[PDB]
């Protein structure tokens, strides 16, 4: 019943938003994968907003758009819930595309995370308040992840 | 169940930064508490108090403020169940770079960076949201509003 | 006539908006200044920039915004002819706010101009290239630019 | 009737040019393609640019310099029309050369914007104010660009 | 008997970490190579220290941590000891990820060294005020370096 | 017994190096202060360096350089104890001096610490390895610091 | 016989070269301060240097530009012998107009020097390689340096 | 007759030191190009400068050293005349081994220059103040540069 929406600028993006969906399934979130860019489909974009914002489900927007992004705030200050900024990694300008995610306006509050891996269990994270399931596979996928640490110490130490 | 904000700066310096944090909350008529604790000087009490919050049987989400090199939100983010939310104070040393620190988290760890004080009790005001139809209408309101005061002051002043 | 329509984030922008109008009005162009926040009043945006669309005369928008400048990028998707950036200055992160202006998609083509003033002159010599009177307006006020300079020297 | 002027300060950034050059095609807008350096062959820029500046005809001129700019600010202070920079790509200290373009005096009012195509797109978009043919030509071209990504979309 | 405790924060740090390891053997330094993370593994990374922290001979922790260094301050805060951090290389937003190293608050003074055999002959160069072995191993080595740059000179 | 030599390169670091002392007194620890430029006066801190260097004593050296600091190096590389490194602090090109603190050939390995108490620190925590009475120190000083955070937090 | 001719970009910058003046002054080296905006005066600059490269006496040319510096590179494409960029200090985007005086193309070999003091010992030391008299008063400068920082050693 | 004295930090320069001395030749000026530490070999560093320092000819040095730069800074502070300081390239922290070349103290004056060639050019430009046949060959030099540009327009 949670549903993330992943929201990206560009179909060039499409690879930052299939590694973001996957780790999703891992959790068992159901996504919907879309394009609209902010810049030229403002319309376009405030439309498909409609659509899913009128569904009665808890929902999370994961927005991606590379160079300066506009799309996370503009789609964060359309929709009532909670989204999430994690635009693709660049090396432009040393990574200063960044700030355009940071550096949003009063009453603006997308959540930035810069892994997508990350972006999806924020999301999973986000829903366990509520959602026992979700809250059992987190548990799950954060203690695997501190067992593996413990066993490559106990395995590697020297 | 009541959500619970739990506020918890490395410093009582950053009492400051909190206090606005806690503010924006209260406009939004969710609970916090204030906390103190040290990443890297006070390690086992900061253990001991979130066992003590993350045994509360109600939603709650975790704002860690800690300046310079943030180890705190990570460290309390790779500890509790669920989300939480960095907020560090604002800081001009090395034109601002404390900020990479609070960014670059090891894959696994996924707190939320938000940098003003207000947003980051937005955020959590939204994440709750989702599940809470009273914070929900206090959320439309509060975004209503600014939206409004925008429009007016283009009305007002517009030539 | 010509028309800029000079469109910005916040009052707070107002100052920096100013500066520019002032200096557009001593290029005998007028002006219109408008207040507009493309993330919380995204259709408020759309509808004033429709009504300026529609006007049957040579339009130029400068777009004003601080921090991650959105603004620029979604007026210049929406409107026709060209538009140009002019925000307002920061030292945040060592101005690192500019590359939210600088760094455009492909088919977004906004202006980047710091200086108020320069902004307005921009504006004046894109009118100047069909404007008589604009780019006679525009060659004094270049000339005077440069005698200040000659004449500083003059005295040394 | 419009003409553009690409100006570069080397032959190294033919590369660059010819992008630009090959857009403003697609407007249907005629161009120039120049080599000159601000800093080594001044006198020769200048007597170009006088020929140029000597043609009834709008026009706008691009400049490219990687580097240190000065060719853009030389030209701008030359001419008596809009000039747009756009200077090739550079990752040379964190692409901090962009400060070059960006940093101009009051009184050089360049245009800056970083990519080729969007630099043909602003010179197309500041003739569109007076010269219907192009007006249309843009028109077309950015919801093009519109309907690719709704295009996309539909696929998801 | 000095002792250096080589913890780094993933099993991807491996080759760094072997970099430090090596360059102490060279030393006639004992060391020993662990895994902990302070954001995962928290409670893990407290018990291992507590257990070092318990033997009563000299030694040394150098903490190796990617991305932003929460193991260096986490460590350094609860040994009583002096630790050093030698993060693994990273050109990540122009190497910003060094000032997690960096700015540690009043209290917290782990010795930050970016290349991993100048961190080895730091904590040489540490036990070397009370141990002479380390201490004329460091002469020879540091002696040879000096020796052999006087030599490329004389080649040439 | 141990000794601390607080090298700074100009009497205008003083001030850093009387909070590095202060803080050494503070742990009881014996200090020198002194003053020598590496790029201006390279003799007198060679021979300075010697006249330390001959002491039977364990022994650190903190220098002070502020701008490109080449201090650090040149004395970490004449003597065959460890150094610390701690520049004054600078907003200079949002504080990229430091930069010239950091990046140190293979074979000069000076511990960088930014804030003068951590220096005096650090410092301490080195002679903690074999100084019980310095030990004892230090574990007054760090367990004090934690208990005023956690009294800092019962107040709420 | 030698002549330093100091040209700033505006008047704005006449504290910075009169900080250069002084300085020169005291090494008994003649100057001059002009004005000329590589950008808006050009043919005015290239009066002035014509003027100056007459003159049979051995010459520097002391550059100084804020923001983004054409200047510089302008002034040494053109003269002969050598040239010293030393532009004002600024803060604006964390110093990065220092990047505009550093990123000069192949053929344009300005010297560049931050402070106004060591811009006007650079140019003593320069022509110092053939003036003695002006060798004599760098040897007496530089010594009065080295013994200043012994002396506060010796106190301190 | 002007002499450069090239002086590296470490033989892993050499490839830009090279690129100095084979422009420096064009012009007709001899050089030397020599290694030697700041930071581990000074009292080195400090005997080569006084040999050099003894010769009755104009003299320049180049000094060249990645990472942070503490050679330019130290020869400067001790010869006489004017240096240059002319770093290698590095995309290390985007670049920032710069500041240690750029950022000395009151009284310690090396040139900075980036490009190799250009160092060169600037060692020619020095002595061209008062060697005609140098001044000579910078006009031959710089003319050609420009020739080549404006030829490069005209196909």
């Given at each position: 019943?949670?549903?993330?929406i992943?929201?990206?600028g560009?179909?060039?993006?499409?690879?930052h938003?299939?590694?973001?969906?996957?780790?999703?399934?891992?959790?068992?979130?159901?996504?919907?994968?879309?394009?609209?860019?902010?810049?030229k489909?403002?319309?376009?974009?405030?439309?498909?907003?409609?659509?899913?914002?009128?569904?009665?489900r808890?929902?999370?927007?994961?927005?991606?758009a590379?160079?300066?992004?506009?799309?996370?705030?503009?789609?964060?200050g359309?929709?009532?819930?909670?989204?999430?900024?994690?635009?693709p990694?660049?090396?432009?300008?040393?990574?200063?595309?960044?700030?355009?995610?940071?550096?949003?306006?009063?009453?603006?509050?997308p959540?930035?995370?810069?892994?997508?891996?990350?972006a999806?269990?924020?999301?999973?994270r986000?829903?366990?308040?509520?959602?026992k399931?979700?809250?059992?596979?987190?548990?799950?996928?954060?203690?695997?992840?501190?067992?593996?640490?413990?066993?490559?110490?106990?395995?590697?130490?020297?």
């Amino acid at each position: 019943r949670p549903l993330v929406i992943i929201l990206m600028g560009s179909s060039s993006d499409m690879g930052h938003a299939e590694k973001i969906a996957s780790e999703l399934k891992t959790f068992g979130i159901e996504y919907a994968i879309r394009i609209g860019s902010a810049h030229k489909t403002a319309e376009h974009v405030v439309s498909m907003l409609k659509e899913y914002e009128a569904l009665d489900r808890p929902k999370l927007y994961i927005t991606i758009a590379g160079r300066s992004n506009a799309l996370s705030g503009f789609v964060d200050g359309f929709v009532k819930g909670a989204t999430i900024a994690c635009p693709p990694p660049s090396d432009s300008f040393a990574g200063a595309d960044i700030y355009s995610s940071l550096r949003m306006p009063s009453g603006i509050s997308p959540a930035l995370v810069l892994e997508p891996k990350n972006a999806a269990l924020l999301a999973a994270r986000i829903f366990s308040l509520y959602d026992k399931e979700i809250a059992d596979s987190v548990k799950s996928y954060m203690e695997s992840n501190a067992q593996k640490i413990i066993e490559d110490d106990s395995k590697l130490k020297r």
